């Protein structure tokens, strides 16, 4: 239905890319013949479901000059044998007669599953026939006019030979949208509905939509309309549709409850997020700040640092210290300061019953990383996967496979053209030096425990969100908070607030006597021996700068 | 009438009413209401009767065609019969509320790996519904037993998605439906219907109908004089129930229990008060206080403290909607359904959005991970779907609509469970439940004994001194058995009880709560953090 570029939201860059890779041939193919350079047979689209790339397909189709022709896997692959190929070849020829036409297929892995990954040799006959037909698209009479379009989630399950040249070259990814992208597609939808919303709180709502998908955004819009309808109905007993239509006006709380009732289907795959945390959210870390900004900014100086002498492209920076103690916070902080993109991969989650699918996740991770090259991979709790083999006979296997594939990915260090990798863990010893071998991850920093000023800054960031009394005294608080970690001290003041709440369910200010009580209750479960070991490892390790 | 169904009746009332109770031009304002619902459950109870009744309450054509009566021998006649019925539905939409009622869709839907003509049938009815979407008042109610029995391809959005279960056979509804049935039957006047009801656990309404049926049947059989007015006696009723087949089969404990049936560990009591119920006042509390609510808490104590009692007392002291999650309720013979009921109960929590959900003895709910390496895959599947769904979060940032359920678990073998469960962000608090001390033993003995026939000779403190390594249930069974000894032995028909019997019963129940096992438990599940 007149599906126009003026309707498709987000994906702007990909829109331009597809438009250009298709337009020039579909405009002046005799330029291509004059060049004699071939015309791209097809282009492989891919991206997780939900974003229903079919949108894009029909859009570009009815956009410029295309005669649409569509076939879908679960629509074609029935219990027929070659009749699938019959239908196929018939479409192919008939649209060949219709040279201004484009064929598209979705779930291309479904119609053509793996050879070893499937059994029905009939399906492989269909594969071979598709191959022959596509060479019939590399035909002279209509050189580069029957544009085949393939789109499915899995690039793996595709048939290898399809990647042979002149058959499927350009792989365009369409991933889950981002904050600005969510906002854009939401606006493009909402275009023709009466509403009373301001684009700022709208951007808030967008921020809310983690792991959300377009199709689900349309469902959200419908839901919110329905619920605001309900709201109006709960003020009038009876009415004809006229005044109903005259009164329905979608507002914020509508969208709120709407989003809260239905959950989206994304958030199993990776997502190109944006660092939300700020340096204005952590205290101190001065030399940490400076060394970190240096570590991230040198790799763009090494052009000219090499021009000076020329020695090495050092990349891998590795923090280590107490558990989760504001470390990842520092990571995201540098991430936002650089303005690059964040791809977190939490270690222990890498254990999946699906043998190798963890590897597969790492693989697509690195693929997207490259695709968004100005970005930063992150790691945490590396020692989880880094429990050495032999201990668990049947479990460490996927672990070593994953670590090997990780090395296999990182290898493209040149290919990692200023694509830095930041990681951090607690017991750095437990890793294999295959990651700590020189070249890949060499710069190391122990995260020093917070000094007095850092503790006071933590206290400031705590008091700035709770109404506290005036009997506060930062000094002895900082005194009796040594051997603790910041977040632990946050929990301390949190529990003191709880104690004041126990004093009265409607009191206002927490009393520091109750704070001292909490201080007594909380114990530092971290002994100084741990710091001794930290600093010893620091002294007895490889490079620091 | 719609005995024992009016609540599901009215929920479905509003749900299906939304497109019908209110006009269309508002939908034409850019809205596409869902069309086509599913009534899954044992029929005969009133499912047919209730859809009748609701099409009435709104005013609609009870087109109660039995789709099982449309099977065909040759492919093509079936599709024409479906054309007939759905076209009559279309002209009904041309006139008014086309409340087409088509039952037993699953028999019309043998799932994949089956023959071909199911494909033609399902795709053709899909054409019917997707086309009649254009028509104004087209609605269909597929009536079956279990949604899983239907065609998967018929569960898409914009397709049969609004699905609701038949009424679960509750006590209240049980009584309602017994009365409703006998409202036309000449049962005896004096009827302790509640007794028979509570005998009839799991028995759906129709079962109860049939039970009353055979009851009155033998009543008429073994009686001949009063050929017209039967005093259908509760004795024959009982004996028939005895004769009848047991039931085919998220049961909230209707039993309320206060903070009096439990003593000892009042520290843990105040803790549970801290991290669970104060959130009720929360919408203004953290405002003047800051700190958020901890998502998940895990209470662990030695098996024998009957923690379930404490959980239920908590659920009592709040009025919040409560649902239980147990392995026996979970371990059905359908693999892949455990995750499903998990999602279902969480959706119910979302429904009664103020909700407190309990995960008992999760080592039973989730067994070992890699102990038996041949049959522990779907368990990890439940693990994954759990780790996903456990993310109940909201805006919760500086009026507020506190739409946030809470989840609390408890078990006895945490060293067995998957470690990622305890993730800060999923289960951000863990609490210890030691077996009672001397004082706790004393108190729990006192409170468990406040209804047994006590004698003027007992001295609970002595037992307390010597009844160490005793669980709550230990002491409860102990005083039980000792009462038994006293009563039977001395007073075959007694009045009092002596402590001597408790002393003797001591060895009769061997307390194997070794303090070394206590230390093991504690160290293990305190390093579990």
Curated annotation (Swiss-Prot), chain A:
It is found in: Cytoplasm; Mitochondrion; Cytoplasm, Cytoskeleton, Spindle. One of its GO terms (molecular function) is ATP hydrolysis activity. Signal peptide: none annotated. ATP 2 binds at residues 321-328. Its EC number is 3.6.4.10. Part of the 55LCC heterohexameric ATPase complex composed at least of AIRIM, AFG2A, AFG2B and CINP. Associates with pre-60S ribosomal particles. It is linked to Neurodevelopmental disorder with hearing loss, seizures, and brain abnormalities: An autosomal recessive disorder characterized by intellectual disability, intractable epilepsy, microcephaly, abnormal muscle tone, and sensorineural hearing loss. This is ATPase family gene 2 protein homolog A. It comes from Homo sapiens.
From Swiss-Prot, chain B:
One of its GO terms (cellular component) is spindle. In the context of 55LCC heterohexameric ATPase complex, the ATPase activity is stimulated by DNA binding and inhibited in presence of RNA. Expressed in both neurons and glia during embryonic and adult stages of brain development. Its EC number is 3.6.4.10. One of its GO terms (biological process) is autophagosome maturation. ATP 2 binds at residues 301-308. GO terms for molecular function: ATP binding; ATP hydrolysis activity; identical protein binding; polyubiquitin modification-dependent protein binding; preribosome binding. It is an enzyme of class 3 (hydrolase). Keywords: Acetylation, ATP-binding, Cytoplasm, Cytoskeleton, Deafness, Epilepsy, Hydrolase, Intellectual disability, Non-syndromic deafness, Nucleotide-binding, Nucleus, Repeat, Ribosome biogenesis. It is found in: Cytoplasm; Cytoplasm, Cytoskeleton, Spindle; Nucleus. ATP 1 binds at residues 41-48. It comes from the Eukaryota. It catalyses: ATP + H2O = ADP + phosphate + H(+). Its main location: cytoplasm. It is linked to Deafness, autosomal recessive, 119: A form of non-syndromic deafness characterized by mild to profound sensorineural hearing loss. Sensorineural hearing loss results from damage to the neural receptors of the inner ear, the nerve pathways to the brain, or the area of the brain that receives sound information. Neurodevelopmental disorder with hearing loss and spasticity: An autosomal recessive neurodevelopmental disorder characterized by hearing loss, global developmental delay, impaired intellectual development, hypotonia, spastic-dystonic cerebral palsy, focal or generalized epilepsy, and microcephaly. Belongs to the AAA ATPase family. AFG2 subfamily. ATP-dependent chaperone part of the 55LCC heterohexameric ATPase complex which is chromatin-associated and promotes replisome proteostasis to maintain replication fork progression and genome stability. Required for replication fork progression, sister chromatid cohesion, and chromosome stability. The ATPase activity is specifically enhanced by replication fork DNA and is coupled to cysteine protease-dependent cleavage of replisome substrates in response to replication fork damage. Part of the 55LCC heterohexameric ATPase complex composed at least of AIRIM, AFG2A, AFG2B and CINP. Associates with pre-60S ribosomal particles. This is ATPase family gene 2 protein homolog B. It comes from Homo sapiens (Human). The chain holds residues 201 to 746 of 753 of the full protein.
């Amino acid at each position: 239905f007149k599906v126009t570029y003026d309707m498709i939201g987000g994906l702007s860059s990909q829109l331009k890319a597809i438009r250009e890779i298709i337009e020039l041939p579909l405009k002046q193919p005799e330029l291509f013949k004059s060049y004699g350079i071939p015309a791209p047979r097809g282009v492989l689209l891919y991206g997780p479901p939900g974003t229903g790339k079919t949108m894009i397909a029909r859009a570009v189709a009815n956009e410029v000059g295309a005669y649409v022709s569509v076939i879908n896997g679960p629509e074609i692959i029935s219990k027929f044998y070659g009749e699938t190929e019959a239908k196929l070849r018939q479409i192919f020829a008939e649209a060949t007669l219709r040279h201004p036409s484009i064929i598209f297929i979705d779930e291309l892995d479904a119609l053509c599953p793996k050879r070893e990954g499937a059994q029905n040799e009939v399906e492989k006959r269909v594969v071979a026939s598709l191959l022959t037909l596509m060479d019939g698209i590399g035909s002279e009479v209509s050189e580069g006019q029957v544009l085949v379009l393939g789109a499915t989630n899995r690039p793996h399950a595709l048939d290898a030979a399809l990647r042979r040249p002149g058959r499927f070259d350009k792989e365009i990814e369409i991933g889950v949208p981002n904050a600005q992208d969510r906002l854009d597609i939401l606006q493009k939808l909402l275009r023709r509905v009466p509403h009373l919303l301001t684009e700022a709180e709208l951007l808030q709502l967008a921020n809310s939509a983690h792991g959300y998908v377009g199709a689900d955004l349309k469902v959200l819009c419908n839901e919110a309309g329905l619920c605001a309808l309900r709201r109006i109905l709960k003020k009038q007993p009876n009415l004809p549709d006229v005044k109903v239509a005259g009164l329905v006006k979608i507002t914020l709380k509508d969208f709120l409850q709407a989003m809260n009732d239905i959950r989206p289907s994304a958030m199993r795959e990776i997502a190109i997020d944006v660092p939300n945390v700020s340096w204005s959210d952590i205290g101190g870390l001065e030399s940490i700040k400076l060394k970190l900004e240096q570590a991230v900014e040198w790799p763009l100086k090494h052009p000219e640092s090499f021009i000076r002498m020329g020695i090495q492209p050092p990349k891998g920076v590795l923090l280590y210290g107490p558990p989760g103690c504001s470390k990842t916070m520092i990571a995201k902080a540098l991430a936002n300061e650089s303005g690059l993109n964040f791809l977190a991969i939490k270690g222990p989650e890498l254990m999946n019953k699906y043998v190798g699918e963890s590897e597969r996740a790492v693989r697509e991770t690195f693929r997207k990383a490259r695709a968004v090259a100005p970005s930063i991979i992150f790691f945490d709790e590396l020692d989880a996967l880094a429990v050495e083999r032999g201990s668990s006979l049947g479990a460490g296997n996927v672990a070593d496979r994953v670590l090997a594939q990780l090395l296999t990915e990182m290898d493209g260090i040149e290919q990692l053209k200023d694509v830095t990798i930041l990681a951090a863990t607690n017991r750095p010893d437990r890793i294999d030096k295959a990651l700590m071998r020189p070249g890949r991850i060499d710069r190391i920093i122990y995260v020093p425990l917070p000094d007095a000023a850092t503790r006071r800054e933590i206290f400031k960031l705590q008091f700035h969100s709770m109404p506290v009394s005036n009997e506060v005294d930062l000094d002895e608080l900082i005194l009796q908070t040594d051997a603790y970690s910041g977040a632990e001290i946050v929990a301390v003041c949190r529990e003191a607030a709880l104690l004041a709440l126990e004093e009265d369910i409607q009191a206002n200010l927490i009393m520091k006597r109750h704070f001292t009580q909490a201080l007594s209750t909380v114990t530092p479960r971290i002994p100084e021996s741990l710091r001794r070991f930290y600093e010893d490892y620091q002294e007895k390790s490889g490079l620091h700068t | 009438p719609l005995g024992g169904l009016s609540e599901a009746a009215d929920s479905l009332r509003e749900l299906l009413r939304l497109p019908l109770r209110y006009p269309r031009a508002l939908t034409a304002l850019g809205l596409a209401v869902p069309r086509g619902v599913l009534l899954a459950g044992p029929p005969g109870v009133g499912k047919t009767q209730l859809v009748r009744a609701v099409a009435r309450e709104a005013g609609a054509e009870l087109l109660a065609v039995s789709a099982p009566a449309l099977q065909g021998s040759r492919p093509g006649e079936t599709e024409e019969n479906v054309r007939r019925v759905f076209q009559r539905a279309r002209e009904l939409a041309s006139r008014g509320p086309s409340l087409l009622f088509l039952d037993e869709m699953d028999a019309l839907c043998p799932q994949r790996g089956s023959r071909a003509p199911e494909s033609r049938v399902v795709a053709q009815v899909l054409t019917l519904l997707d086309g009649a979407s254009g028509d104004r008042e087209v609605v269909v109610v597929g009536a079956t037993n279990r949604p899983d029995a239907l065609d998967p391809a018929l569960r898409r959005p914009g397709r049969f998605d609004r699905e609701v279960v038949i009424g679960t056979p509750t006590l209240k509804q049980r009584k309602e439906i017994l009365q409703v049935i006998t409202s036309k039957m000449p049962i005896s006047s004096h009827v302790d219907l509640g007794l028979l009801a509570e005998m009839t656990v799991g028995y759906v309404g129709a079962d109860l109908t049939a039970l009353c049926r055979e009851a009155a049947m033998h009543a008429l059989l073994h009686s001949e004089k009063n050929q017209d007015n039967p005093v259908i006696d509760e004795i024959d009723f009982l004996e028939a129930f005895k004769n009848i087949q047991p039931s085919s089969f998220g049961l909230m404990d209707i039993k309320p229990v206060d903070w009096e049936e439990i003593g000892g560990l009042e520290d843990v009591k105040l803790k549970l008060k801290q991290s669970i119920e104060w959130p009720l006042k929360f919408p203004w509390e953290f405002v003047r206080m800051g700190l958020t609510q901890p998502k998940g808490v895990l209470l662990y104590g030695p098996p024998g403290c009957a923690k379930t009692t404490l959980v239920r007392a908590l659920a009592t002291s709040c009025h919040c909607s409560f649902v239980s999650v147990s392995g026996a309720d979970l371990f059905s013979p359908f693999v892949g359904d455990s995750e499903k009921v998990l999602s279902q109960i969480f959706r119910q929590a979302r429904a009664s959005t103020p909700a407190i959900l309990f995960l008992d003895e999760i080592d039973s709910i989730l067994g070992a991970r890699s102990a038996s390496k041949t049959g522990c895959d779907v368990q990890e599947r439940v693990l994954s779907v759990l780790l996903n769904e456990l993310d109940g979060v909201g805006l919760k940032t500086i009026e507020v609509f506190n739409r946030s359920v809470m989840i609390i678990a408890a078990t006895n073998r945490p060293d067995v469970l998957d470690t990622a469960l305890l993730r800060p962000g999923r289960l951000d608090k863990i609490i210890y439940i030691p077996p009672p001390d001397h004082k706790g033993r004393l108190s729990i003995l006192k409170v468990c004994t406040k209804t047994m026939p006590i004698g003027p000779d007992v001295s609970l403190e002595n037992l307390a001194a010597e009844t160490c390594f005793f669980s709550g249930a230990d002491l409860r069974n102990l005083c039980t058995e000792a009462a038994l000894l006293a009563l039977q032995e001395n007073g075959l028909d007694a009045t009092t009880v002596k402590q001597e019997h408790f002393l003797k019963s001591l060895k009769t129940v061997k307390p194997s709560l070794s303090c070394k096992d206590l230390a093991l438990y504690e160290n293990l599940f305190k390093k579990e953090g």
